[PDB]
Homo-oligomer: 260 residues x 4
């Protein structure tokens, strides 16, 4: 039973993922009561591109042994990869609807970075470091597609350029955290940045819902100081001063949006 | 049965390819009905230099189980390696017949690059990336030896220098795609470049068959603009503008050669 | 019995430490008389962060087979890691009591370097090279916390700055030996440097116990020439001249402290 | 039987060489008729420093199966390592007898490079590349100790400086081939260089045996042009021109020494 599991692990060490998955399937055929076999089969199938078979293997492993958190780990990993691909295609659709080559190439680079981080987490599934890194990355691309849909609903060139700057800083911070996964400083920087983007999109949505020139100019002012401070903290992540500055800024945006 | 297969895999992980192949042979001796055993034995024997034994193992694996595409994969890999060695010796023979030290050292560097890519695909057989990369490389060296035979059949110094420039850009693009295998931009660049070289050799062959000064000068003009645009796209691969430019150029060469 | 040991080793090769530890536990469940199983389980559990389970596994392996020195090796490794964490928290407490941001960030960087060396020795336990490297590092942080407690007991700004310089050169030499573990030159440099720091802390403690202005100025003079020569030998480790110079200096400090 | 062999291989993959050797010994205890077990045990024991146990394991593997050339391979590897250590201690003794710090540090660097190449071939035993590389290196250190003994027998400062230059270029070429093992150009360069050193030591020995001022000046002239051309070919290894130049020079030295 476990002999073919060892064989599949060995084949996976030699980068022969396909033969590894075949040996895992054969081991499961010998004894389908092996949760580790289904677990490894899903893990290796994730690397091939057959996300559906990997999800089925994860479901089988979870149903066979619920206490196995590692099975739940790659289950959430597959969910996150599907979520990231959905956000990527949504960003592509929004960029195509806008027609701007700038936002189109930015969405393309964002998709490329998401795929790179997905390949990284596929190579190292158990590492909570890159797990949470890609979690921040996927909320980043989600905030990005929310900003894109808000910009499309608005239609003004000013807020269009504002959303362009926001998604630019977003993908820049995402590239930073992808290059440096195990650095808590850029981790906190990314968390603060995505919180700032969430506050910014909420504020601009509320301003567009109101529809007054004064509140629109106020919204442009807060998002402009927000992109300023976000670029500042992205260039200087290890500064608790600028961290508290962004925290104060997002607190002020929240106070303003709940006041209006 | 599978115990010695595991032993051979382990030995192959330790870079002990010879003992790995011996353990694979012993595993096949224990049970010759193991397609995976023959498959791994051929894969590891490819790395030793015994292409004949690897081809025999591939044939045995295919005849035992035809559905195994990975066996067909290294079968085509061995075919491609033999094809590349044949093109390499043909290029060496043509360069020696021409006597030019320039074309001789270019053929030598081309053989070196082909051997490097062959070693790479031997180390990573299952990767369709480097598989198709070496496929483009082998059609590149085939177009190169076709250009060499055409230049030898012509004998003019002008077309000799033209073929020199073509094989120079060919080996440069081949080195580029060998250094960067997983980049679709240089993949498309190499495909476009080899299409351009095919059109160029066809056009110059037709011009030499005609044998008129005006059509010869026209051929020299198209191949000169072709090497210009090929160097341009090789220096700027990520430019869809120059990609479409080369596409238009090869379309014009095809139209001209079918018109004459 | 050994099948699950092989399975755990294979899983550990794939960076699946958790499943590796689970397979090791299952192998021990199959036969608890396997000293190698307990040994590997402790080794892999050290990497997870469960130092207690790793220490228990080391104790089990030692009690099952005392002749196994490798078990004693990671036993001492766990003891050293606990010792280093204790020295790290003591340095943090001393830096917080002093309130100086300089000494606080120095203690933070020292903790970071200690954790990095601990992760390195966890990845490569059997290497006596990094073993003894982290041994010198832990006596370095111990001399550092001794200097911190001496500076806190003194309270003078002069000796405070002196201790700051000593811990600065200490953490610099520790970073050097962590970056270059397999270099006997920096090994001897670190040994000489920690001997110099031990002599310096002993001398300054004796001077503070005496409490005379002349012996205090003499102590400041010896520690100043000591930090001078220590920086010199840290910048030029491969100089037997400066090595003998530091040896003469520490001999003079010992003679003076035993004379007073 | 083979289960413990797999266990030892796995442990060796994790850099646990000691436990790997222990598992190999246990596998041999289970069945001493395993030539592969003795082979792997010797291979791994070579890495520990117990050259005697590795040599005994090699002898056992050869006596059990003579057809195993890989056993003969690490047998010759151990012989070469012992030969290199003997040449290293002979060079150290000669440098100490001469008392020159220059030749002493050169012999020290030569010993360091020999040990580095020995560790490399221990890590990769089956690679004929580094095998033959260290073969050229060991004939290089042998020619070096021959030059040292010749310089000691002569005693003149001129020939002392000449031998210093020869051993300098020798260790430089040896460092080059150690840094670049898989480069046939530096392989041929090293072969030509060691042939030149052999001719030079033979010529200077014959000149010292004759003992005439004119033949001594002639010998100094040939060794000076030899070190000139050797430095030239070491700086430009890929030049067949300088290769043929050194070949002509060594041919002239041979003609002269057989004429006198």
């Amino acid at each position: 039973a476990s002999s073919w599991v060892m064989l599949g692990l060995l084949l996976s060490l030699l980068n022969r993922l396909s033969l590894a998955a075949e040996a895992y399937k054969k081991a499961i055929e010998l004894d389908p009561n092996d949760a580790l076999a289904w677990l490894l089969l899903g893990s290796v199938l994730l690397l091939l591109g057959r996300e559906e078979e990997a999800e089925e293997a994860a479901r089988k492993a979870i149903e066979l042994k619920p206490e196995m958190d590692s099975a739940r780990r790659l289950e959430g990993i597959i969910e996150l990869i599907r979520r990231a691909r959905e956000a990527a295609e949504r960003a592509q659709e929004a960029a195509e609807r806008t027609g701007d080559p700038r936002v189109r190439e930015l969405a393309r680079e964002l998709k490329r970075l998401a795929q790179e981080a997905a390949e990284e987490v596929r190579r190292d599934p158990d590492s909570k470091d890159v797990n949470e890194a890609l979690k921040l990355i996927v909320e980043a691309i989600e905030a990005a597609v929310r900003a894109l849909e808000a910009a499309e609903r608005t239609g003004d060139p000013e807020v269009r350029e504002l959303a362009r700057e926001l998604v630019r800083l977003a993908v820049e911070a995402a590239e930073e955290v992808q290059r440096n996964p195990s650095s808590s400083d850029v981790n906190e920087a990314l968390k603060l940045i995505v919180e700032a983007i969430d506050a910014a999109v909420r504020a601009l949505e509320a301003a567009e819902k109101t529809g007054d020139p004064e509140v629109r100019e106020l919204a442009r002012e807060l998002v402009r100081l927000a992109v300023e401070a976000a670029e500042e903290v992205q260039r200087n992540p290890s500064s608790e001063e600028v961290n508290e500055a962004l925290k104060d800024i997002v607190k002020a945006i929240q106070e303003a949006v709940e006041s209006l």
